[PDB]
Amino acid sequence: GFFGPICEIDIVLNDGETRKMAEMKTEDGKVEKHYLFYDGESVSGKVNLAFKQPGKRLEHQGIRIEFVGQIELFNDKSNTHEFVNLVKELALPGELTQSRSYDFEFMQVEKPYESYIGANVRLRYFLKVTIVRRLTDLVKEYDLIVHQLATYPDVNNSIKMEVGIEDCLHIEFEYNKSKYHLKDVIVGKIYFLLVRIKIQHMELQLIKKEITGIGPSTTTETETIAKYEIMDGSIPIRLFLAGYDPTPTMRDVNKKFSVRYFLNLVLVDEEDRRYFKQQEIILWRKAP
């Protein structure tokens, strides 16, 4: 809110009217809406600097606009990795005396990673206007969201996961895929191969792990996205992802950040003993 009464910085995209706005659920329980972009698309528009009152001035050492793709870690070192930064100088040192607008166009912009808002990390893209000044610079950011579309073979090669303790409990879970899209469905069955104990309560879990930092600084957030009970006392299984709106798997993004999903089979007996097994599955976003 610096110099609000004097002037306003407004950033406007040339093609906003026909460009969709994606939503991103932040943890604060809020919902952000920003224009959706894809890798390779051009980013162009205008920067409007409008004076509200007459006879006012703003001395500066230059004005520019940057397109920024950033991975920001929320640790004590505030580790930030800018994987993309395009700059366009808009004005040389001088002073703003009257409302002015500047056109800009970043062409065929590389946006290699999908946007992400996590617990200890966020990967975001944004336009940033900076008016350099002797004291604090005036800055205006304009957030954009980037989705990454993919396509896989979609083969039907089942997968097997085994749980238990030898000569006590042996369970097998066979599901149809290694990879699923955000609205896909997981299909499989839990075969019992030996039950020397009393199966009190068991369930299939869809677990999310967000890994940040590296070395002695490696942080990990684990969240359960879905529980598929089967408790009770050869049981088919069908789990619909659409109902949870997960985010895609993000792996080859950066040495300091990954998001992976895992299927977790948990079995507990009357004696309260826990038998578990975990296997990773890859979630991806399918083109319309």
UniProtKB/Swiss-Prot annotation:
Which PANTHER family did the record assign? VACUOLAR PROTEIN SORTING 26 RELATED
How would you summarize the oligomeric state and partners of this protein? Component of the heterotrimeric retromer cargo-selective complex (CSC), also described as vacuolar protein sorting subcomplex (VPS), formed by VPS26 (VPS26A or VPS26B), VPS29 and VPS35. The CSC has a highly elongated structure with VPS26 and VPS29 binding independently at opposite distal ends of VPS35 as central platform. The CSC is believed to associate with variable sorting nexins to form functionally distinct retromer complex variants.
The protein's induction, as recorded, is:
Down-regulated in Alzheimer disease. No polymorphism or variant is however associated with Alzheimer disease for VPS26A.
Gene name of the record: VPS26A
> What is the purpose of this protein?
Acts as a component of the retromer cargo-selective complex (CSC). The CSC is believed to be the core functional component of retromer or respective retromer complex variants acting to prevent missorting of selected transmembrane cargo proteins into the lysosomal degradation pathway. The recruitment of the CSC to the endosomal membrane involves RAB7A and SNX3. The SNX-BAR retromer mediates retrograde transport of cargo proteins from endosomes to the trans-Golgi network (TGN) and is involved in endosome-to-plasma membrane transport for cargo protein recycling.
Q: Which is a GO BP term held by this UniProt record? A: retrograde transport, endosome to Golgi
- The source's domain of life comes to Eukaryota
Keyword presence, tRNA processing: no
Q: Where in the cell is it found?
A: Cytoplasm; Endosome membrane; Early endosome
Q: Name one Pfam family in it.
A: Vps26
Q: How does it sit in the membrane?
A: Peripheral membrane protein
Mind naming one GO cellular-component term on file for this protein? endosome membrane
Give the family per the record: Belongs to the VPS26 family.
- Keyword Membrane attached: yes
Q: Please provide the record's keywords in A-Z order.
A: Cytoplasm, Endosome, Membrane, Phosphoprotein, Protein transport, Transport
Q: Which InterPro entries match?
A: Arrestin-like_C, Vps26-related
What's the protein called, per UniProt?
Answer: Vacuolar protein sorting-associated protein 26A
